[PDB]
Amino acid sequence: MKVEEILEKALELVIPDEEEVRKGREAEEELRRRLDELGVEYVFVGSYARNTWLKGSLEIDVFLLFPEEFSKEELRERGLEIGKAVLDSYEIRYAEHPYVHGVVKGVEVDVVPCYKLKEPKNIKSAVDRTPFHHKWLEGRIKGKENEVRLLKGFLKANGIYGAEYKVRGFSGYLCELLIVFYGSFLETVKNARRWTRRTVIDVAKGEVRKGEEFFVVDPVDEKRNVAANLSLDNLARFVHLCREFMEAPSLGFFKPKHPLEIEPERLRKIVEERGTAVFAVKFRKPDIVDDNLYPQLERASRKIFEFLERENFMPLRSAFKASEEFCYLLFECQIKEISRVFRRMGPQFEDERNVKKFLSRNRAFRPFIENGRWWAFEMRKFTTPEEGVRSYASTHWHTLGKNVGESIREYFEIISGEKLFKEPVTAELCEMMGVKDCCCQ
Amino acid sequence: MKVEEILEKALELVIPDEEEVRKGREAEEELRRRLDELGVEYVFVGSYARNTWLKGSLEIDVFLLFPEEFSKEELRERGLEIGKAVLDSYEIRYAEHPYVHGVVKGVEVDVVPCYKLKEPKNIKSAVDRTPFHHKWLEGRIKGKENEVRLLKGFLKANGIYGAEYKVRGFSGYLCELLIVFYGSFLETVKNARRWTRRTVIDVAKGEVRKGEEFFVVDPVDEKRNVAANLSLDNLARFVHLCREFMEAPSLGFFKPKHPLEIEPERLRKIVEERGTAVFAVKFRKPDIVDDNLYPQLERASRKIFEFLERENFMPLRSAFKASEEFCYLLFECQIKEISRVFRRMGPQFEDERNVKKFLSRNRAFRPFIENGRWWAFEMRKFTTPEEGVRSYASTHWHTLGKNVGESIREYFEIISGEKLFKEPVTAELCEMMGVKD
RNA sequence: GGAAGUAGAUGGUUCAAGUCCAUUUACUUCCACCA
RNA sequence: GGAAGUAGAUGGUUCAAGUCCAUUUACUUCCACCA
Numbered sequence: 001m002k003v004e005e006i007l008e009k010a011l012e013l014v015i016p017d018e019e020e021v022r023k024g025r026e027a028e029e030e031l032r033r034r035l036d037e038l039g040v041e042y043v044f045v046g047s048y049a050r051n052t053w054l055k056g057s058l059e060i061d062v063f064l065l066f067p068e069e070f071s072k073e074e075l076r077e078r079g080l081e082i083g084k085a086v087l088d089s090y091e092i093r094y095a096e097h098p099y100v101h102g103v104v105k106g107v108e109v110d111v112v113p114c115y116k117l118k119e120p121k122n123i124k125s126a127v128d129r130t131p132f133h134h135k136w137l138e139g140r141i142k143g144k145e146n147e148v149r150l151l152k153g154f155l156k157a158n159g160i161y162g163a164e165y166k167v168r169g170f171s172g173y174l175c176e177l178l179i180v181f182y183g184s185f186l187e188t189v190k191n192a193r194r195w196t197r198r199t200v201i202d203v204a205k206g207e208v209r210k211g212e213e214f215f216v217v218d219p220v221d222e223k224r225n226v227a228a229n230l231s232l233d234n235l236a237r238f239v240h241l242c243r244e245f246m247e248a249p250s251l252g253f254f255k256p257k258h259p260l261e262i263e264p265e266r267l268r269k270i271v272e273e274r275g276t277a278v279f280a281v282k283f284r285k286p287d288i289v290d291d292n293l294y295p296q297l298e299r300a301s302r303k304i305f306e307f308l309e310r311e312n313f314m315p316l317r318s319a320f321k322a323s324e325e326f327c328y329l330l331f332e333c334q335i336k337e338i339s340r341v342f343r344r345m346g347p348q349f350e351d352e353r354n355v356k357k358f359l360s361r362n363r364a365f366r367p368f369i370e371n372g373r374w375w376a377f378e379m380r381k382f383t384t385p386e387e388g389v390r391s392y393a394s395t396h397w398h399t400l401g402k403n404v405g406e407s408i409r410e411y412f413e414i415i416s417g418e419k420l421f422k423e424p425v426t427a428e429l430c431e432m433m434g435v436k437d438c439c440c441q
Numbered sequence: 442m443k444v445e446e447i448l449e450k451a452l453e454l455v456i457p458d459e460e461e462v463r464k465g466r467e468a469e470e471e472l473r474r475r476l477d478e479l480g481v482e483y484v485f486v487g488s489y490a491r492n493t494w495l496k497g498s499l500e501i502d503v504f505l506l507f508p509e510e511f512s513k514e515e516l517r518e519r520g521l522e523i524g525k526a527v528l529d530s531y532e533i534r535y536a537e538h539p540y541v542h543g544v545v546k547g548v549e550v551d552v553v554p555c556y557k558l559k560e561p562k563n564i565k566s567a568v569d570r571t572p573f574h575h576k577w578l579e580g581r582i583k584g585k586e587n588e589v590r591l592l593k594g595f596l597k598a599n600g601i602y603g604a605e606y607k608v609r610g611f612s613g614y615l616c617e618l619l620i621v622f623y624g625s626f627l628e629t630v631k632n633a634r635r636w637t638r639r640t641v642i643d644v645a646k647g648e649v650r651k652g653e654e655f656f657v658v659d660p661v662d663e664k665r666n667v668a669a670n671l672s673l674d675n676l677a678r679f680v681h682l683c684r685e686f687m688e689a690p691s692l693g694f695f696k697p698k699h700p701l702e703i704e705p706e707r708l709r710k711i712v713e714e715r716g717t718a719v720f721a722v723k724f725r726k727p728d729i730v731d732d733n734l735y736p737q738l739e740r741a742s743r744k745i746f747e748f749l750e751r752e753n754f755m756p757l758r759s760a761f762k763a764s765e766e767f768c769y770l771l772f773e774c775q776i777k778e779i780s781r782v783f784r785r786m787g788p789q790f791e792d793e794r795n796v797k798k799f800l801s802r803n804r805a806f807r808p809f810i811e812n813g814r815w816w817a818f819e820m821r822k823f824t825t826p827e828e829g830v831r832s833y834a835s836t837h838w839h840t841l842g843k844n845v846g847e848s849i850r851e852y853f854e855i856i857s858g859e860k861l862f863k864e865p866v867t868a869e870l871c872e873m874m875g876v877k878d
Numbered sequence: 879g880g881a882a883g884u885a886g887a888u889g890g891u892u893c894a895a896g897u898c899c900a901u902u903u904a905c906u907u908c909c910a911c912c913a
Numbered sequence: 914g915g916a917a918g919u920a921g922a923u924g925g926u927u928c929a930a931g932u933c934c935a936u937u938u939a940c941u942u943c944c945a946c947c948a
C-alpha cells in the first residue's frame with residue numbers, strides 16, 4: 001500500500017523473466033557469430049546492450065560502423081546487404097535512415113549502418129550519436145536498470161512512451177538520462193511534478209535551468225534536445241500523472257488500459273445528449289510508414305478544424321485513426337446547422353466611390369447602415385459542417401498533406417450517425433468527447 | 442422634369458393652403474385675447490411665428506416669460522395654471538420640462554413656461570434659449586421660409602424629421618439654421634453630400650469646418666450642438682439620400698414611403714429562406730412618455746443583443762416596436778440551436794493548485810489537456826436563443842431600463858413563427874431583414 | 879514526410895489584402911524512422 | 914428617463930476573472946419632452 005510495496009509489485013510487470021533473458025542471450029550469441037564470420041565492424045547498443053529493456057519487448061540493436069568517407073548511398077547498400085545476410089527473416093521499411101529489421105532465433109533485431117565518427121559533432125547520418133549514447137551510459141547506468149524499467153513501464157502504461165510521431169512521447173534513451181540525473185524512478189517522478197514548459201535538464205552539467213522550451217541536453221551533443229519530439233501536451237500529461245501518483249500511489253499506474261467495446265446505442269445516446277455534430281472524413285490509407293503518415297493526419301485534421309472554426313461551426317476537438325486500409329479524420333462541432341444568411345462589412349458612409357462599388361452587386365436583401373458603416377446580407381453555400389467539409393476537402397485536398405491529400409483527391413466520404421459508430425473509431429470518439437468509463441484495466 | 446421643376450411640384454406638398462393659414466390666425470387671435478386678459482408676459486415663438494411649418498402640420502408655440510426669481514416649482518404651477526385656463530382642451534404629459542398641450546378653435550397649441558433672462562448662457566430652465574432662437578431667425582428667415590418647408594418635407598418623408606428619441610433626426614430649428622447657412626434647400630442638399638461625421642457648421646461665423654463630431658453650433662449658444670441628438674446613422678442616411686437625389690431627382694423623395702403590407706405567410710417564407718431564428722420579447726408597454734420609453738427600448742434591445750453575442754447565437758440585427766398595449770424586442774440570430782456541450786478554459790498545467798480545483802468540479806465528461814492547458818466540457822442550461830433570452834430577461838430584468846425592466850419583471854413572453862407574424866411588427870421585421878418589393 | 883526560419887513570386891476572396899484562403903521559387907535548420 | 918465622465922462600495926460567475934455578468938453611494942456634465 002505504501003510506494004515501496006507498489007514499486008516492488010510494479011517490478012514484476014517490467015523486469016524480463018529468465019526465459020526471455022535466455023532467448024535474448026542465445027540470439028545475441030548467434031548474431032555475434034554471423035557478424036564475426038563476415039569480418040565486419042559492429043557494436044551492440046540500445047536497451048538490450050544495457051539491460052534496460054521492458055519485459056515482453058526484447059529487441060536487439062546492432063550498429064555497423066562504416067568509414068566516415070562513405071556516401072549515403074554506400075551506407076544504404078552495405079548496411080542493407082549485411083542486415084539481410086545476418087537475419088533469419090527480414091523487413092525493410094524506413095522513412096529516411098536505412099536499416100534492416102528482422103529476426104534471429106525468434107528475437108527481433110534492428111541492424112543499423114552508421115558512420116564511425118571520432119566525435120558526435122556535425123553528425124553525418126541521423127543515427128551517429130547512438131554508439132556515443134551507449135558509451136556514455138554504460139558505466140553510469142549500472143545498478144539502476146530496474147529504475148529505468150519502472151519509468152519506461154509507467155510511461156508505456158500511460159501511452160506516452162516513445163518519441164516516434166505516432167506517440168510524441170519519451171524515448172528509452174530519455175528515460176535512461178532521467179534516471180542518471182535523478183537517481184531513481186521515485187526521484188524522477190517527485191521532481192517532474194515541478195517541471196514547466198521552460199525546464200532545461202542538462203545531465204552532463206548536473207544542472208536544471210530555465211530556457212525557451214523543455215530541453216533535455218544530450219550529454220553527447222549539447223545542441224541536441226533528447227526531448228525534441230515530446231509534445232507540450234504529453235509533457236503536461238506526465239507532470240499531472242507524477243502529481244497524481246505521489247498523491248495516491250497505486251499499481252494501477254503501471255497497468256495499461258484498453259478501450260471497451262461500446263455499442264452504437266450508447267454512442268447514439270451520448271451524441272444526442274451532447275447535441276453536437278459528430279462526423280468523419282474517411283479515405284484510403286496511403287501505403288507509407290507511420291512516421292510519414294501521422295504528421296500528415298495531424299496536418300489534414302488541423303486544416304479542416306481551422307476551416308470549421310472560421311466558418312463559425314465551433315468545432316470542439318478533432319481526432320484521427322489509421323486502420324489497415326482506411327484513415328478517418330474525426331470532428332465534433334457545436335453548430336449542426338447555421339443560417340444561410342450572414343453579414344458582410346461594407347465601407348464607411350463618407351467614402352462615396354467605395355459605397356457605390358459595395359451597393360452595385362445585386363443581392364436578395366437590401367444593404368443597410370449600422371454605426372456609420374454599410375453592411376450587406378449575403379448567403380452561404382453550405383449550412384452544415386459536413387457540407388462545409390465536403391466543399392473544403394474537395395477543393396483544398398492539396399493542403400492536407402502530400403500523401404493524405406493525394407488520397408483525399410482520389411476518394412473521400414463524410415460519415416456520421418450509426419454509419420460512423422460502426423467504423424473502427426469508437427475509442428477515438430470516446431477520448432475526443434471525454435466519455436467516462438470507456439476504458440478498462 | 443429636371444431639378445428645379447421637381448422642387449416646384451414639391452411645394453404643393455409642403456406649403457399650407459390659405460384656409461389652414463387662416464385657421465391658425467384666428468386661433469392666434471383667440472390666444473392673444475385670452476392671454477391679454479390675465480396680463481401675462483408671453484411671446485409667440487417657433488415655426489408658426491416664423492411662418493415655416495409644413496402643410497397639415499400646424500402647431501402654435503406660446504412662451505410664458507417669468508422673472509428669474511421664480512422657483513423651479515412656481516414656474517411649473519403658475520405656468521401650468523395659465524396654460525389650462527387659456528386652452529379649450531388640454532393634456533399635461535412631459536418628460537422633464539413642464540408645459541401644456543391643447544386645442545384652441547381646432548388648432549394644436551403648446552403653452553410653455555420659461556425664465557426671461559438676459560443672455561441664453563448659463564441656462565436656468567431647459568427651454569430658455571427658444572425665445573432667443575426666434576429673435577435670431579426673425580428677419581434672416583424671411584424670403585427663405587419655403588426653402589425651410591422643402592427641407593422639412595424632405596426629412597419628414599424619409600423618417601428623419603425630429604430631434605426626439607423616437608426619431609433622433611433633425612429638429613425644425615436646425616432645418617432653419619441650415620437654410621440660413623446655405624441659402625436654399627438645393628444648396629443644403631448639394632453640400633450635405635460632402636458632410637462627414639466630423640463636420641462642424643458654425644452659422645454665427647458662416648463657415649463649415651472639421652472638428653471632433655457632427656456639431657451644428659447654436660448662434661445664440663456656442664456651447665450647444667443643435668444636432669446633439671442626430672444619430673450618426675441618420676446623418677449617414679441623409680448624406681446618402683442627398684447623393685441619391687442629386688444623382689437622380691424625384692418627387693418620390695417628398696412622399697412618405699408606402700406602408701407595403703406583408704402577410705404572415707410571405708414573411709414566414711423569407712425567414713425560412715434566411716434560415717435564421719427570428720423571435721420577439723413581448724411585454725406590456727410602460728405608461729410613460731415616448732422620450733422616456735424609446736431610450737429604454739434601445740437599452741433593453743442592446744443588453745439582450747449583447748447576451749446573444751456572448752452566448753454564441755450570432756445575432757444579426759435587432760429592432761423594437763411600441764404598440765398601444767405592448768412593446769416588442771425583435772431579434773434575428775444565425776443559430777437556431779446550439780449544442781448542449783461546450784468548452785470552458787482552465788489553468789495552465791504547471792499551476793498544481795488551480796488544476797486540482799479545476800478538476801475537483803463535478804461534470805458530465807472528462808476534462809482534457811490542449812496546448813499546455815486544461816479544458817472542461819461543460820453543459821448548457823439552454824440550447825436555443827429563445828430559451829437563452831427567456832433566462833436572461835427573467836434574471837436581468839433590472840438592467841433593461843427602469844420601466845421597461847419593471848414591466849418585463851412582472852410578465853413577458855418569447856414569441857416566434859406564425860404567432861409573431863400576427864403581431865404588428867411586420868414593418869420592423871422587413872426593415873431588420875432588408876426585405877425588398 | 880512534417881515543422882520552424884529567411885528572401886522573394888503569384889492566384890482567389892473583398893468596396894478595400896503585408897493583413898483572410900491558397901499556390902509557388904531559393905537558401906537555412908530541426909524532428910520522426912536507430913538510440 | 915437615457916447617455917458621457919470624476920472618486921469609490923459591493924455581489925455573482927469562474928481554477929482564477931481590478932479584465933466576465935451585474936448591483937450601489939456621492940459629485941459632474943449632456944440629451945429628449947418647447948425650440
Ligand SMILES: Nc1ncnc2c1ncn2[C@@H]1O[C@H](COP(=O)(O)OP(=O)(O)OP(=O)(O)O)[C@@H](O)[C@H]1O
Nearest residue numbers: 344345346347348373891892893894895896897898
Ligand atoms: N481587402 C480586405 N478584405 C477583407 N478584409 C480586410 C481587407 N483588408 C484588411 N482587412 C482586414 O484587416 C486585417 C488586416 O490588418 P490591418 O493592419 O489592415 O488592420 P485593418 O484591417 O485596417 O483594421 P481596422 O480596419 O479595424 O483598423 C485582415 O485580417 C482583415 O480582417
Ligand SMILES: [Mg+2]
Nearest residue numbers: 046047059060
Ligand atoms: Mg530495442
Ligand SMILES: [Mg+2]
Nearest residue numbers: 487488500501
Ligand atoms: Mg410647433
